[PDB]
Amino acid sequence: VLVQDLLHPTAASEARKHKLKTLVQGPRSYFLDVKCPGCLNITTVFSHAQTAVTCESCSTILCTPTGGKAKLSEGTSFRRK
Amino acid sequence: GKGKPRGLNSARKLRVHRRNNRWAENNYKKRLLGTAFKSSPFGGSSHAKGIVLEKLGIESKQPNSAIRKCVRVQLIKNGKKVTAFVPNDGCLNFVDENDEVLLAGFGRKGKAKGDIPGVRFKVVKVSGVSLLALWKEKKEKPRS
Amino acid sequence: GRMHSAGKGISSSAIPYSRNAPAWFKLSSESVIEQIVKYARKGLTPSQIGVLLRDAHGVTQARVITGNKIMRILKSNGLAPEIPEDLYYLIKKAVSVRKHLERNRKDKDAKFRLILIESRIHRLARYYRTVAVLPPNWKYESATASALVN
Amino acid sequence: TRSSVLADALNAINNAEKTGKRQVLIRPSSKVIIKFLQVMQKHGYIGEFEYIDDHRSGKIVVQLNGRLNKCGVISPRFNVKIGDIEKWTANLLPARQFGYVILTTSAGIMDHEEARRKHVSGKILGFVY
RNA sequence: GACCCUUAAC
RNA sequence: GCGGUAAUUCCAGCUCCAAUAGCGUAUAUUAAAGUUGUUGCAGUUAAAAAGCUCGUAGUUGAACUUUGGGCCCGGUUGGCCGGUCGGAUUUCCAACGGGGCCUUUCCUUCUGGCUAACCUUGAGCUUGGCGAACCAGGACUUUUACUUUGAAAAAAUUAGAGUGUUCAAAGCAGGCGUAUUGCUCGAAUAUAUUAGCAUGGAAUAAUAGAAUAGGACGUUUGGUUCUAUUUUGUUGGUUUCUAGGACCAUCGUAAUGAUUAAUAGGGACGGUCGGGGGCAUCAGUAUUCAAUUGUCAGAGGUGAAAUUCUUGGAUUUAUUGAAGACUAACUACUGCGAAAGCAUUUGCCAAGGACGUUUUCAUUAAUCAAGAACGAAAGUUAGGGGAUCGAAGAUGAUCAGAUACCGUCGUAGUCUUAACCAUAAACUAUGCCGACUAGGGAUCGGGUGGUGUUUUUUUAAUGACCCACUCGGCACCUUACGAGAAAUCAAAGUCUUUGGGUUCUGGGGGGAGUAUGGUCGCAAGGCUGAAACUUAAAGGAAUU
RNA sequence: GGAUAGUGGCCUACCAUGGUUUCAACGGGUAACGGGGAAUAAGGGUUCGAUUCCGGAGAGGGAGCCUGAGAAACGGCUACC
């Protein structure tokens, strides 16, 4: 381990370490497209939302704040990005 | 960072810190307090003359057993009463009483030379004649 | 770190490398500006605006999508708070601790904490007067902090 | 807090050199660091180093050959007259025929022998040998 | 359970 | 240390050694002394990290703005070796040290009696024009520190060149001829402390410019005092399109104009977490009772006893009992707090770290004389409570005691104050902030990933477990690379290969943390803090 | 304004508390005239410098003054101690 490629770490090693310890720090969170059943009303939701997001149509709360990633409401579907 | 400041503009702190800490040195403290001038019986001089007041029988400090021959001397310039060793064998009979003697330190810078308690000085001349001269019979003390 | 504590935690946002982002944002910059304004008019601080922008809208951050940060947008169109929101919350905390202390005079922990909060207030206010965000002679006064919170 | 990034960079190089590692990551890659490395590189004490452009401050990975014995920082950056170069080289360089005192002059970052032939002086950054 | 002391005399 | 009756140490003789016309001694001072430490000290235990946090001065403080590429050049060229003397010639090679020109690059541009590098040109080179190897006419070369360069250390002195004072210290003299004329070289040259000038130096390091434009460009169009010389009858003043330092007055031009978002810091938000704090409440033993009942008469206490309580019933047994204190067991190489410290329940009140964050601000920071908050126990005023234990205060053993250790008691003594006090082996005897340097598991928080295992109405919200990460924390296995005097050390390493920032402290032992003093305190005392004198050791860690 | 050779709180007629200060003022000590220099040195330093040169001050202690271009002179004067 005296000789190491510090410019091209493996994706497994980079993904394992802390988000500020990678070669260039990047957010591990992501945005997701959440819809309630029935009406589409696609709402973009932060993964670590920390505020109860409801869709723009009515009071249809889509996620619950959590210490880490926001937990989505029971009846809903989400797509990454 | 090693304690002491290192900045390029910290010369005053280093200066003042050194000044304060030189007082823990015995020689710097003694010199700048003027203790020799104000407290030592020679007043800061190498030698002093005085008058013999009494012959002394200072006992030796342990583990040696001997009677060091000394004289109480009142210094002329001060009036301070000191004790001066008469060094060589039989030189007490040259420094008997009431004469004018020249005194020097023991080389210890104010401490005891050996097993002699409390004695700081020694005799070097008697009535203007070197004690070594009388001990080596080269000169004799003025009879009249 | 942690000026007034021994805590050494390193937890913060990891801003993405990309400056011009996100390529899945189908909205316009001007639509984000007015959305910020209509949040600020409802009494929301730039931190609260950014959280809601990032939460219920696809706003990475205002700086990336628009040209400027939120506090820059609020200042530009006249919705800048009279004192900065960070200093405001520090004063609000000092007010609430001080109100607590007047009912609990034996709470020596709260007396120690009040010193720390006002040390932070005075160091932050000194910075804001230096950069002239706060006018010179602006002072944190405990007696009038509560009424002049807003 | 962080006071001298050159000090942390040179410390990372020294600690990597002492453990035999051929490479070291440096954060956060100031331009003074790069100039100090290029002077090192020109004399062959390090090898290749790659700057990493994270949009914040920069990262450096330095390839290390086994040649460098000690690189260091002199803090503070003392003012060095032309006549004071001899005292600095004789105080920290292991010999007279090799080793360099690196100083920043108004003509750029350079080692002491280059400042002698260009007849310039300034403030001392560090040393390499 | 109780239990103090020990050459000045090469 | 030698001398206490074969002393290599004293008194002498002999011999010998060192320096030598000089050699001892005394006192200071310099080196030795890395024992004053900027270079360059030490602070776990040898002396020394303030009890702990805040905090002003001081010191210090992340990164970023022209980091590159071409062209040519009067210039010691070392050698491709006797064309510029036992001897050396720039063209087939040096780092060329430097200069100028292009590459968006710009070292302020305009008055004219001089007309300079420019296709305005009489023979292999100027008889019209664009400017620094030339020039006086602009308030404006951001502010500095740090350059190199030197207009300068009065001489003497120091370093030092020459010199036949006989040498030398010295001195600044001298040297040489047509034997007889006269002539001539000297008396150089050199920042051992720091502030003015420098068409060439911006690398390093800061409170500088344009952010509700008050900004720049000016020969856009105006217009607003002016001691106004050049030209017009008294000396002088009164008047225009003039050349000049005026308002951003504007149908101008300009990619018009505040770098990043530091595994710096602050703030926000979310779910948590904790014996962190405060105020109320709510529960678990003894001590003294009460009415029971039991009795021989014992109980208590100890190494063994004794003091002591027992008809009047001690001790012991067993539900409505007046109190006060404490929070066991769970309880750990566990948690929280700045430390001191904090452990029953529940309610209330503010606070906090860590985590997570594609939130926000933006260098607001680190450490800190002076200054400030808190600060165990004991102690001190004051009212309430006083169960328990228990400094002080009487029996027994020791006897020479035992006004000690042990028994039994027992006053003061751990709650609320204007409250005070401010000290502890307040300890990790390890100042704080930052970076880096080996291994390996576990644990406390918090997150992330595993349709992992198990769980109401059994496999329709979750929780609790298991693996893998990760951030932060309490810690944990070695005479281990490295460090150390060693003990030992996850820092006590990265330290003669000595410099990341910064605060405090120490300089042999004692006298002595002893005041002639000052200051705080009700006092007890705290903080600050010597000298005389006296010592050759005191001390640390090992070994036997 | 006066005085001075001349500037100047140098002195005389007013407001304002102006001036200095932990970057150490102001007090205290100096066995303190300052410097060129001396001794000692690996480099940095430490100590000394009454004294051959330069500057200052003094003529037993204070004070005052004449003459003179120049002295508050002392191998000039005046007075007190």
PDB file of C-alpha atoms (C1' of nucleotides) in Angstrom, chain F residues 269-497:
ATOM      1  C1'   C F 269     -34.016  22.985   9.542  1.00  0.00           C
ATOM      2  C1'   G F 270     -35.104  17.269  10.683  1.00  0.00           C
ATOM      3  C1'   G F 271     -35.287  12.852  13.467  1.00  0.00           C
ATOM      4  C1'   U F 272     -32.935  11.814  17.483  1.00  0.00           C
ATOM      5  C1'   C F 273     -29.822  11.249  21.910  1.00  0.00           C
ATOM      6  C1'   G F 274     -27.955  12.125  27.027  1.00  0.00           C
ATOM      7  C1'   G F 275     -27.543   9.960  35.145  1.00  0.00           C
ATOM      8  C1'   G F 276     -26.334  18.225  31.107  1.00  0.00           C
ATOM      9  C1'   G F 277     -29.192  22.303  34.004  1.00  0.00           C
ATOM     10  C1'   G F 278     -33.491  24.615  36.787  1.00  0.00           C
ATOM     11  C1'   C F 279     -38.478  24.487  39.171  1.00  0.00           C
ATOM     12  C1'   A F 280     -42.442  21.452  41.106  1.00  0.00           C
ATOM     13  C1'   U F 281     -44.282  16.560  42.078  1.00  0.00           C
ATOM     14  C1'   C F 282     -43.964  10.889  42.925  1.00  0.00           C
ATOM     15  C1'   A F 283     -41.875   6.479  44.991  1.00  0.00           C
ATOM     16  C1'   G F 284     -38.285   2.833  47.746  1.00  0.00           C
ATOM     17  C1'   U F 285     -34.146   2.205  54.779  1.00  0.00           C
ATOM     18  C1'   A F 286     -32.982   3.647  59.089  1.00  0.00           C
ATOM     19  C1'   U F 287     -34.108   6.806  64.018  1.00  0.00           C
ATOM     20  C1'   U F 288     -37.910   7.720  67.294  1.00  0.00           C
ATOM     21  C1'   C F 289     -42.890   6.117  68.320  1.00  0.00           C
ATOM     22  C1'   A F 290     -47.898   3.793  69.096  1.00  0.00           C
ATOM     23  C1'   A F 291     -50.617  -0.138  70.663  1.00  0.00           C
ATOM     24  C1'   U F 292     -49.557  -5.930  70.241  1.00  0.00           C
ATOM     25  C1'   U F 293     -46.630 -10.322  72.763  1.00  0.00           C
ATOM     26  C1'   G F 294     -43.249 -13.270  73.847  1.00  0.00           C
ATOM     27  C1'   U F 295     -39.206 -13.506  78.629  1.00  0.00           C
ATOM     28  C1'   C F 296     -36.039 -17.218  80.164  1.00  0.00           C
ATOM     29  C1'   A F 297     -33.588 -12.395  81.872  1.00  0.00           C
ATOM     30  C1'   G F 298     -30.542 -10.682  78.431  1.00  0.00           C
ATOM     31  C1'   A F 299     -29.318  -7.058  74.525  1.00  0.00           C
ATOM     32  C1'   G F 300     -25.425  -4.236  72.409  1.00  0.00           C
ATOM     33  C1'   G F 301     -20.371  -4.008  71.205  1.00  0.00           C
ATOM     34  C1'   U F 302     -15.062  -6.243  70.368  1.00  0.00           C
ATOM     35  C1'   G F 303      -9.074  -9.108  68.834  1.00  0.00           C
ATOM     36  C1'   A F 304     -11.093  -9.618  74.021  1.00  0.00           C
ATOM     37  C1'   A F 305     -13.777  -6.472  76.836  1.00  0.00           C
ATOM     38  C1'   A F 306     -15.818  -2.373  79.094  1.00  0.00           C
ATOM     39  C1'   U F 307     -18.812   2.278  78.823  1.00  0.00           C
ATOM     40  C1'   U F 308     -24.405   1.545  77.816  1.00  0.00           C
ATOM     41  C1'   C F 309     -29.981  -0.322  77.741  1.00  0.00           C
ATOM     42  C1'   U F 310     -32.949  -3.945  80.528  1.00  0.00           C
ATOM     43  C1'   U F 311     -39.245  -5.393  87.232  1.00  0.00           C
ATOM     44  C1'   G F 312     -40.684   0.224  85.289  1.00  0.00           C
ATOM     45  C1'   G F 313     -39.933  -5.766  79.822  1.00  0.00           C
ATOM     46  C1'   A F 314     -34.365  -4.405  77.084  1.00  0.00           C
ATOM     47  C1'   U F 315     -33.190  -6.928  72.527  1.00  0.00           C
ATOM     48  C1'   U F 316     -36.442  -9.627  69.249  1.00  0.00           C
ATOM     49  C1'   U F 317     -41.887 -10.494  66.353  1.00  0.00           C
ATOM     50  C1'   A F 318     -45.776  -8.536  63.639  1.00  0.00           C
ATOM     51  C1'   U F 319     -50.655  -3.408  58.451  1.00  0.00           C
ATOM     52  C1'   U F 320     -53.690   2.748  59.128  1.00  0.00           C
ATOM     53  C1'   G F 321     -47.497   6.257  62.298  1.00  0.00           C
ATOM     54  C1'   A F 322     -44.861  13.151  62.899  1.00  0.00           C
ATOM     55  C1'   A F 323     -39.930  12.999  60.617  1.00  0.00           C
ATOM     56  C1'   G F 324     -35.002  14.051  57.679  1.00  0.00           C
ATOM     57  C1'   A F 325     -31.481  12.249  54.508  1.00  0.00           C
ATOM     58  C1'   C F 326     -30.148   9.122  50.555  1.00  0.00           C
ATOM     59  C1'   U F 327     -31.539   7.124  45.541  1.00  0.00           C
ATOM     60  C1'   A F 328     -29.144   0.676  46.297  1.00  0.00           C
ATOM     61  C1'   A F 329     -29.501  -3.767  43.275  1.00  0.00           C
ATOM     62  C1'   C F 330     -29.719  -2.404  37.314  1.00  0.00           C
ATOM     63  C1'   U F 331     -24.300   0.372  37.134  1.00  0.00           C
ATOM     64  C1'   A F 332     -20.194  -0.884  32.681  1.00  0.00           C
ATOM     65  C1'   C F 333     -12.776   0.159  31.020  1.00  0.00           C
ATOM     66  C1'   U F 334     -21.093   2.984  29.827  1.00  0.00           C
ATOM     67  C1'   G F 335     -23.626   8.371  28.985  1.00  0.00           C
ATOM     68  C1'   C F 336     -23.799  13.901  29.617  1.00  0.00           C
ATOM     69  C1'   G F 337     -21.415  18.529  31.133  1.00  0.00           C
ATOM     70  C1'   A F 338     -16.468  23.845  30.390  1.00  0.00           C
ATOM     71  C1'   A F 339     -14.833  22.007  34.611  1.00  0.00           C
ATOM     72  C1'   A F 340     -16.584  21.373  39.658  1.00  0.00           C
ATOM     73  C1'   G F 341     -19.956  17.658  38.715  1.00  0.00           C
ATOM     74  C1'   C F 342     -24.628  14.797  37.305  1.00  0.00           C
ATOM     75  C1'   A F 343     -28.394   8.215  38.743  1.00  0.00           C
ATOM     76  C1'   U F 344     -36.510   7.232  41.606  1.00  0.00           C
ATOM     77  C1'   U F 345     -41.353   8.801  38.611  1.00  0.00           C
ATOM     78  C1'   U F 346     -44.007  12.435  36.098  1.00  0.00           C
ATOM     79  C1'   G F 347     -45.100  17.605  34.505  1.00  0.00           C
ATOM     80  C1'   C F 348     -43.074  22.237  33.048  1.00  0.00           C
ATOM     81  C1'   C F 349     -38.919  25.482  31.423  1.00  0.00           C
ATOM     82  C1'   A F 350     -35.147  27.077  28.543  1.00  0.00           C
ATOM     83  C1'   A F 351     -30.222  24.773  26.715  1.00  0.00           C
ATOM     84  C1'   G F 352     -26.674  21.388  24.117  1.00  0.00           C
ATOM     85  C1'   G F 353     -23.279  18.047  21.279  1.00  0.00           C
ATOM     86  C1'   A F 354     -23.194  14.495  17.330  1.00  0.00           C
ATOM     87  C1'   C F 355     -25.490  13.151  12.987  1.00  0.00           C
ATOM     88  C1'   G F 356     -28.091  14.347   8.382  1.00  0.00           C
ATOM     89  C1'   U F 357     -28.691  18.649   4.822  1.00  0.00           C
ATOM     90  C1'   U F 358     -27.741  19.695  -3.432  1.00  0.00           C
ATOM     91  C1'   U F 359     -30.390  25.241   3.386  1.00  0.00           C
ATOM     92  C1'   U F 360     -28.067  30.057   4.537  1.00  0.00           C
ATOM     93  C1'   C F 361     -24.068  33.786   5.688  1.00  0.00           C
ATOM     94  C1'   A F 362     -19.439  34.382   4.212  1.00  0.00           C
ATOM     95  C1'   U F 363     -13.633  34.670   6.769  1.00  0.00           C
ATOM     96  C1'   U F 364     -17.231  36.296  10.614  1.00  0.00           C
ATOM     97  C1'   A F 365     -11.404  32.459  12.844  1.00  0.00           C
ATOM     98  C1'   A F 366      -7.280  30.264  16.570  1.00  0.00           C
ATOM     99  C1'   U F 367      -5.013  31.367  21.044  1.00  0.00           C
ATOM    100  C1'   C F 368      -5.298  34.798  24.366  1.00  0.00           C
ATOM    101  C1'   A F 369      -2.083  39.938  29.144  1.00  0.00           C
ATOM    102  C1'   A F 370      -6.159  43.105  31.505  1.00  0.00           C
ATOM    103  C1'   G F 371     -10.874  41.862  32.466  1.00  0.00           C
ATOM    104  C1'   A F 372     -15.420  38.155  33.596  1.00  0.00           C
ATOM    105  C1'   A F 373     -18.888  33.566  34.790  1.00  0.00           C
ATOM    106  C1'   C F 374     -18.728  28.921  37.167  1.00  0.00           C
ATOM    107  C1'   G F 375     -15.839  26.453  40.647  1.00  0.00           C
ATOM    108  C1'   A F 376     -15.893  19.464  45.192  1.00  0.00           C
ATOM    109  C1'   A F 377     -15.178  19.313  50.308  1.00  0.00           C
ATOM    110  C1'   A F 378     -14.380  21.951  54.428  1.00  0.00           C
ATOM    111  C1'   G F 379     -15.338  26.869  56.428  1.00  0.00           C
ATOM    112  C1'   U F 380     -18.333  31.821  57.291  1.00  0.00           C
ATOM    113  C1'   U F 381     -22.297  35.166  58.230  1.00  0.00           C
ATOM    114  C1'   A F 382     -28.635  34.410  58.460  1.00  0.00           C
ATOM    115  C1'   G F 383     -33.950  32.694  59.289  1.00  0.00           C
ATOM    116  C1'   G F 384     -36.352  26.568  58.326  1.00  0.00           C
ATOM    117  C1'   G F 385     -35.271  21.671  59.129  1.00  0.00           C
ATOM    118  C1'   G F 386     -31.593  18.316  62.270  1.00  0.00           C
ATOM    119  C1'   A F 387     -33.377  11.122  60.652  1.00  0.00           C
ATOM    120  C1'   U F 388     -28.438   9.497  59.945  1.00  0.00           C
ATOM    121  C1'   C F 389     -23.418   9.865  60.456  1.00  0.00           C
ATOM    122  C1'   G F 390     -20.222  12.903  63.132  1.00  0.00           C
ATOM    123  C1'   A F 391     -13.926  17.704  63.421  1.00  0.00           C
ATOM    124  C1'   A F 392     -14.692  19.373  69.188  1.00  0.00           C
ATOM    125  C1'   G F 393     -15.975  17.228  73.812  1.00  0.00           C
ATOM    126  C1'   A F 394     -15.929  11.577  78.740  1.00  0.00           C
ATOM    127  C1'   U F 395     -15.040   5.159  79.287  1.00  0.00           C
ATOM    128  C1'   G F 396     -11.615   0.729  77.982  1.00  0.00           C
ATOM    129  C1'   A F 397      -6.483  -1.606  75.849  1.00  0.00           C
ATOM    130  C1'   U F 398      -1.018   1.257  76.274  1.00  0.00           C
ATOM    131  C1'   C F 399       1.022   1.330  80.253  1.00  0.00           C
ATOM    132  C1'   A F 400       5.777   5.257  79.779  1.00  0.00           C
ATOM    133  C1'   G F 401       1.763   6.976  78.213  1.00  0.00           C
ATOM    134  C1'   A F 402      -2.434   7.096  74.333  1.00  0.00           C
ATOM    135  C1'   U F 403      -6.433  13.679  75.452  1.00  0.00           C
ATOM    136  C1'   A F 404      -4.458   8.060  68.999  1.00  0.00           C
ATOM    137  C1'   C F 405      -5.933   4.108  66.284  1.00  0.00           C
ATOM    138  C1'   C F 406     -11.064   0.364  68.672  1.00  0.00           C
ATOM    139  C1'   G F 407     -16.590   0.878  71.942  1.00  0.00           C
ATOM    140  C1'   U F 408     -20.564   3.947  73.224  1.00  0.00           C
ATOM    141  C1'   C F 409     -22.384   8.814  72.930  1.00  0.00           C
ATOM    142  C1'   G F 410     -22.359  13.410  71.172  1.00  0.00           C
ATOM    143  C1'   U F 411     -22.196  19.669  69.716  1.00  0.00           C
ATOM    144  C1'   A F 412     -20.710  22.112  65.026  1.00  0.00           C
ATOM    145  C1'   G F 413     -21.445  20.243  60.387  1.00  0.00           C
ATOM    146  C1'   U F 414     -24.264  18.264  53.254  1.00  0.00           C
ATOM    147  C1'   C F 415     -31.689  23.035  52.405  1.00  0.00           C
ATOM    148  C1'   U F 416     -32.956  28.638  51.157  1.00  0.00           C
ATOM    149  C1'   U F 417     -30.165  33.244  51.048  1.00  0.00           C
ATOM    150  C1'   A F 418     -27.486  40.223  49.931  1.00  0.00           C
ATOM    151  C1'   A F 419     -25.369  35.201  50.516  1.00  0.00           C
ATOM    152  C1'   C F 420     -19.851  34.645  50.986  1.00  0.00           C
ATOM    153  C1'   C F 421     -15.370  32.008  50.383  1.00  0.00           C
ATOM    154  C1'   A F 422     -12.251  30.452  45.471  1.00  0.00           C
ATOM    155  C1'   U F 423      -9.237  26.470  47.353  1.00  0.00           C
ATOM    156  C1'   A F 424      -8.118  20.422  46.295  1.00  0.00           C
ATOM    157  C1'   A F 425      -3.229  14.770  44.244  1.00  0.00           C
ATOM    158  C1'   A F 426      -9.568  20.911  41.237  1.00  0.00           C
ATOM    159  C1'   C F 427      -4.957  14.695  38.023  1.00  0.00           C
ATOM    160  C1'   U F 428      -4.924  12.476  32.265  1.00  0.00           C
ATOM    161  C1'   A F 429       0.115  15.417  37.679  1.00  0.00           C
ATOM    162  C1'   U F 430      -0.247  15.659  29.848  1.00  0.00           C
ATOM    163  C1'   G F 431      -2.747  24.084  27.620  1.00  0.00           C
ATOM    164  C1'   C F 432      -5.679  24.995  23.327  1.00  0.00           C
ATOM    165  C1'   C F 433      -6.481  25.053  17.739  1.00  0.00           C
ATOM    166  C1'   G F 434      -4.798  22.586  13.012  1.00  0.00           C
ATOM    167  C1'   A F 435      -2.429  18.877   9.718  1.00  0.00           C
ATOM    168  C1'   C F 436      -0.115  14.175   8.896  1.00  0.00           C
ATOM    169  C1'   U F 437       1.952   9.226  10.419  1.00  0.00           C
ATOM    170  C1'   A F 438       0.867   2.021  11.870  1.00  0.00           C
ATOM    171  C1'   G F 439      -2.077  -2.063  12.988  1.00  0.00           C
ATOM    172  C1'   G F 440      -7.463  -4.641  15.340  1.00  0.00           C
ATOM    173  C1'   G F 441     -11.804  -5.329  17.416  1.00  0.00           C
ATOM    174  C1'   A F 442     -15.690  -3.373  20.627  1.00  0.00           C
ATOM    175  C1'   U F 443     -19.011   0.325  22.395  1.00  0.00           C
ATOM    176  C1'   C F 444     -22.304   5.126  22.819  1.00  0.00           C
ATOM    177  C1'   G F 445     -25.039   8.668  19.568  1.00  0.00           C
ATOM    178  C1'   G F 446     -26.649   9.747  14.467  1.00  0.00           C
ATOM    179  C1'   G F 447     -27.045   8.522   9.406  1.00  0.00           C
ATOM    180  C1'   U F 448     -26.486   5.051   4.730  1.00  0.00           C
ATOM    181  C1'   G F 449     -27.144   0.051   2.320  1.00  0.00           C
ATOM    182  C1'   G F 450     -28.728  -4.995   2.618  1.00  0.00           C
ATOM    183  C1'   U F 451     -37.373  -7.426  -0.303  1.00  0.00           C
ATOM    184  C1'   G F 452     -31.162  -9.707   5.582  1.00  0.00           C
ATOM    185  C1'   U F 453     -33.853 -12.334  11.323  1.00  0.00           C
ATOM    186  C1'   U F 454     -38.058 -11.666  14.345  1.00  0.00           C
ATOM    187  C1'   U F 455     -42.615  -9.153  15.766  1.00  0.00           C
ATOM    188  C1'   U F 456     -50.554  -6.060  16.668  1.00  0.00           C
ATOM    189  C1'   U F 457     -55.805  -8.355  14.272  1.00  0.00           C
ATOM    190  C1'   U F 458     -50.158 -13.637  13.652  1.00  0.00           C
ATOM    191  C1'   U F 459     -46.920 -12.843   7.654  1.00  0.00           C
ATOM    192  C1'   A F 460     -51.192  -4.386   5.806  1.00  0.00           C
ATOM    193  C1'   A F 461     -47.594   1.944   9.831  1.00  0.00           C
ATOM    194  C1'   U F 462     -43.002   0.275  12.625  1.00  0.00           C
ATOM    195  C1'   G F 463     -39.903  -1.452  16.424  1.00  0.00           C
ATOM    196  C1'   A F 464     -36.052  -4.796  18.231  1.00  0.00           C
ATOM    197  C1'   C F 465     -31.898  -7.750  16.387  1.00  0.00           C
ATOM    198  C1'   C F 466     -27.782  -9.311  12.153  1.00  0.00           C
ATOM    199  C1'   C F 467     -23.956  -7.870   8.519  1.00  0.00           C
ATOM    200  C1'   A F 468     -21.421  -3.789   5.758  1.00  0.00           C
ATOM    201  C1'   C F 469     -20.058   1.251   5.732  1.00  0.00           C
ATOM    202  C1'   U F 470     -19.516   6.196   7.669  1.00  0.00           C
ATOM    203  C1'   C F 471     -19.239  10.704  10.840  1.00  0.00           C
ATOM    204  C1'   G F 472     -18.585  12.265  15.953  1.00  0.00           C
ATOM    205  C1'   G F 473     -17.380  10.496  21.159  1.00  0.00           C
ATOM    206  C1'   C F 474     -15.700   7.565  25.782  1.00  0.00           C
ATOM    207  C1'   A F 475     -12.056   4.141  25.664  1.00  0.00           C
ATOM    208  C1'   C F 476      -9.280  -0.324  24.638  1.00  0.00           C
ATOM    209  C1'   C F 477      -3.475  -5.223  23.212  1.00  0.00           C
ATOM    210  C1'   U F 478       2.578  -5.219  23.641  1.00  0.00           C
ATOM    211  C1'   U F 479      10.302  -1.857  26.508  1.00  0.00           C
ATOM    212  C1'   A F 480       6.438  -0.994  18.576  1.00  0.00           C
ATOM    213  C1'   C F 481       8.918   2.241  13.005  1.00  0.00           C
ATOM    214  C1'   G F 482       9.299   7.057  15.698  1.00  0.00           C
ATOM    215  C1'   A F 483       9.979   9.368  20.794  1.00  0.00           C
ATOM    216  C1'   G F 484      11.905   9.013  25.630  1.00  0.00           C
ATOM    217  C1'   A F 485      16.658   9.190  31.228  1.00  0.00           C
ATOM    218  C1'   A F 486      13.713   5.385  31.697  1.00  0.00           C
ATOM    219  C1'   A F 487       9.036   4.275  33.510  1.00  0.00           C
ATOM    220  C1'   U F 488       6.370   4.445  29.257  1.00  0.00           C
ATOM    221  C1'   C F 489       3.793   6.979  24.973  1.00  0.00           C
ATOM    222  C1'   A F 490      -2.327   5.675  19.387  1.00  0.00           C
ATOM    223  C1'   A F 491       1.015  10.928  21.269  1.00  0.00           C
ATOM    224  C1'   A F 492       4.841  12.072  25.247  1.00  0.00           C
ATOM    225  C1'   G F 493       5.651  10.722  17.114  1.00  0.00           C
ATOM    226  C1'   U F 494       6.333  13.920  12.487  1.00  0.00           C
ATOM    227  C1'   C F 495      12.176  17.384  17.485  1.00  0.00           C
ATOM    228  C1'   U F 496      21.004  18.861  16.229  1.00  0.00           C
ATOM    229  C1'   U F 497      17.781  16.340   9.236  1.00  0.00           C
TER     230        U F 497
END
